[model samples]
Target: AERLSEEEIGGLKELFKMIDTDNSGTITFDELKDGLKRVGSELMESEIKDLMDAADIDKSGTIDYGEFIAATVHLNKLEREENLVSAFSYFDKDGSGYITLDEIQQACKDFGLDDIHIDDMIKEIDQDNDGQIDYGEFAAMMRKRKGNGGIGRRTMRKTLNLRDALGLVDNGSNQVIEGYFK
Candidate 1:
């Protein structure tokens, strides 16, 4: 997970307040929909329900402050230099700088994900015919989110100006202001 800066946390606070229209400390599906609409975001009704369901990590039937922060985190966090280097070194055990099938299996097993297909991953992450995941290829996958990072699973419904809802500047050039890519 990416560490949120103070500025980012504070900015996200604003969005939580706005989303919880009644200021009840929790966001209902209705409030979330109307709140998003107030900021010019119009996600489909069922999709908004999906958003709530995903964000409501505790299944409390409403999204709280903590959940909203996790939900609205920007997808752009993958580009951060620290995160890229950190993740690369993590998988590139033995300091080889190239992730091979051995390292992948070891890492996946450590994470309790033993069901991975090594060939499938190598085919996707290896782009230069190296038959292994190099730094460049690994970085590419992280940026494009091979797994989850900031913004997590809410990425599927990507038609809203979430940045606008967060009170951040939106140039409008990007059709969907995906929270703050900065």
Candidate 2:
């Protein structure tokens, strides 16, 4: 497992505390499932059990802080990868495997990411200096941003928020949005 910084470990510890509702210093499978459910995860029972089995290195019935941290960190990595891929696909609208500066700008606007400077972003990600972003370059850029813990993470979080909002609207949960504003 990769070593995490104190800040990262601290954040994971906080998450673990939130999940360990019983204050038992460890998280049971039930607690894990319930916590994930609250956050909108629809993982099946077998899938949750698989996650626990993979993370419980000591064959313990519950997941300790260290194990939980490792598991969550791994999950976060996978999620970020998935997000990056999705973002790439969104930008590469024509399926050309490359995104133009105009496409990037338009995507930013569509996603409500007004803060992104297309020229600067392109320069950063267009590794070949070709004035275009291929999937490889895009993935590299996202991975770099993920490691630095900066705007990329913020963008991803905001995108997920928008997705959740849209899902709620689609489900006719307009009351939730009204309550949020209240």
Candidate 3:
């Protein structure tokens, strides 16, 4: 692996700090496990152990900065590839050229939820009033609902009246639409 530039070093220092709960300068397998969970990723213990074993080249039971960076780069590459492949499979459930609301809704439903009010939920999240959610809207809603990457439950649950809707629209702010757009 190439040596990290100063800029990459700063970025990685930040990433390490974010996940290193103990600030130990080394990421233990347990740290990775807990950090992934905090970020809403689920992984089997055995799978995690295997990953750690593979990445822990020095057999140190932890990933030092160099090892961590190299492992992360490779892991990110594979994860991206796998995610793209999986998403393609998801959208191509029927081998169709286009995806539909039914497919999207079913995917959402499969992610564990205690209850779902589909119609109301759709209206609540579809800020553009387009009657159907586009890819961006779908991604935004899922990220928000999942409480990852800056979207939070309060933001997802907050109700908006028509006046608020108009205010946002008039201001041309791309804020989330409140209430059912119906």
Candidate 4:
């Protein structure tokens, strides 16, 4: 499980409260399905059932706060994975499945990240020392940064902040959308 900040947990609690519609302190399948949809989840019926099965530890057929928090944290990770993929694609402008130094520099320029040195960023992520960032390396870098509570997260947050500044993402009322990348 990913470690969440105090603010992140508080934000999830707020979302859980909003989705509990009837204030029943627990979320039924119907409510979970509807809430998931509202929050932009396009999960299939089976996937939803799988999620519920995993979260509903007591087999109570309903998700309480603990279950909801666990499920939400998992969902947040999925969203970050998607966002990381998107960010990688955005940087890999040539569609070569690898990020070159020029691409990195151009991406920084476009994102107003003039202080970000292409060489440093590439060296940090190019684990294979191949002088280029392959998808595996990019994914590894992003995964390492996911809720890492350090420079990794800070770098990722900067990237996400740039995306948000450009209006490329719609966070809506779901804190997961914004909080995951943060």
TM-score of each: 0.36, 0.37, 0.37, 0.36
Tens digits of lDDT, candidate 3, 63-174? 6766666566767642433222233244324423223445444544433322356555445555445323433344444453333332222222344311211231122336
lDDT of each: 0.53, 0.55, 0.47, 0.55
Q: Give the per-residue lDDT digits (tens) of candidate 2, residues 1-182.
A: 57644565456576776677675777776776665676676554434444665555553547777778777866874243324445455566564556776676565552354445555766755654565565545655545433332332223323431112223112222333222342
lDDT value, candidate 1, whole model: 0.53
Model 1 is weakest, by summed lDDT over 10 consecutive residues, at 153-162
Q: 10-39, model 1: which lDDT tens digit per residue?
A: 566777778887858677766766667787
- Give the Å shift of residue 49 in candidate 3: 1.5
Collision pairs in model 1: none
Q: Which ten residues in a row have the lowest lDDT in candidate 4?
A: 149-158
Candidate 4 displacement at residue 38 in angstroms: 1.1
lDDT of 2: 0.55
The Cα RMSD of model 4 versus the native structure comes to 18.1
> What stretches of model 4 exceed 4 Å from their correct place?
1-5, 8-10, 78-182
For candidate 4, the TM-score is 0.36
- Model 2, residue pairs in steric clash: none
Question: Weakest 10 consecutive residues, lDDT, candidate 2?
Answer: 161-170
Better structure of 2 and 3 per lDDT: 2
